[PDB]
């Protein structure tokens, strides 16, 4: 039940000693399914730091201190292993390789595009695959709609304008317009679809009076000629 | 498949027009469409039927 978010909620509510998660087998082990080895850089580790620093006062009501300290031992051991491996890795380097430039370009651009979830070109119907497109657009809409409205730039070209304490520079909004062109272009999609239908179903709906090589064929001219035959008058 | 279109007529005429030019250059065989319709054993079997009809009618 997200104990690694329950610690964050108890920290941000500023009352963590008053509850202390009721560390028994019935409560502290029901959310764990040891502790699950936190994932973040420090956002789930500083919480463990503060949690141990608050639980130094009771020291016996909470039996889960030992598994947390075992994970501190694991973190210290992994850190010492990485420091020894970084000491050896800087000694295992060849004296000459002369890494190529125009492949370093491609690795940097490819890593940068693979960070922020966009498609990388290689250079090295069916409503199953219709929903898998219409579920990537809701991703982008509900990711752009969580940006703060007070978003603003600071380009490297405001130094040539000498902005005072209150001067209102003229390149402050080169990202918030761009973060609304996407968010409103991804909501006007089923309007340009309905305009493209009215375009194609009135250009292709003639198809034999505008295109020259179709209205000059034998069979099209014969069909258009034969539909215009006025019915025979008996007597 | 009961009806025809402009695409069907154009494809039929283009196919039948390219099959005729490929017999001058002899880059297509077309021996199967020849011999499945000639079929000389069927021809002599039919001639034997005509001969038996001559015998039965005389």
């Amino acid at each position: 039940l997200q104990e690694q978010s329950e610690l964050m909620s108890t920290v941000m509510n500023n009352t963590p000693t008053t509850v202390a998660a009721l560390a028994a087998v019935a409560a502290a082990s029901e959310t764990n399914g040891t502790i699950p080895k936190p994932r973040s850089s420090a956002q789930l580790e500083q919480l463990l730091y503060r949690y141990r620093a608050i639980q130094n006062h009771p020291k016996e009501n909470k039996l889960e201190i030992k598994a947390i300290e075992d994970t501190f031992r694991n973190i210290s051991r992994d850190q010492d292993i990485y420091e020894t491996k970084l000491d050896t890795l800087r000694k295992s380097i060849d004296k000459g390789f002369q890494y190529d430039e125009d492949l370093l370009n491609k690795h940097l651009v490819a890593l940068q595009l693979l960070e922020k979830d966009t498609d990388v070109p290689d250079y090295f119907g069916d409503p199953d695959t219709e929903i898998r497109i219409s579920a990537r657009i809701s991703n982008r809409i509900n990711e752009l709609e969580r940006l703060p409205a007070n978003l603003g730039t600071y380009s490297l070209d405001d130094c040539l304008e000498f902005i005072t304490k209150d001067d209102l520079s003229s390149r402050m909004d080169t990202f918030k317009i761009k973060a609304l062109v996407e968010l409103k272009s991804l909501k006007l999609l089923t309007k340009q679809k309905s305009i493209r239908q009215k375009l194609i179903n009135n250009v292709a709906s003639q198809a034999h009076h505008n295109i020259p090589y179709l209205r000059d064929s034998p069979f099209t001219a014969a069909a258009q000629r034969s539909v215009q035959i006025r019915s025979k008058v008996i007597v | 498949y009961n009806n025809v279109t402009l695409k069907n007529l154009t494809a039929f005429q283009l196919l039948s027009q390219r099959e005729n030019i490929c017999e001058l250059l002899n880059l297509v065989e077309s021996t199967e469409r020849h011999n499945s319709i000639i079929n000389p054993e069927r021809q002599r079997m039919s001639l034997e039927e005509m001969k038996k009809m001559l015998d039965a009618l005389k």
Partner: peptide, 26 residues
Amino acid sequence: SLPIEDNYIREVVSKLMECVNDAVQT
């Protein structure tokens, strides 16, 4: 982990003789 310019991503990114041999003959 600095983003790259968009205008740089957009910047880095036997059938012959079979007729002739039959056209020479006929």
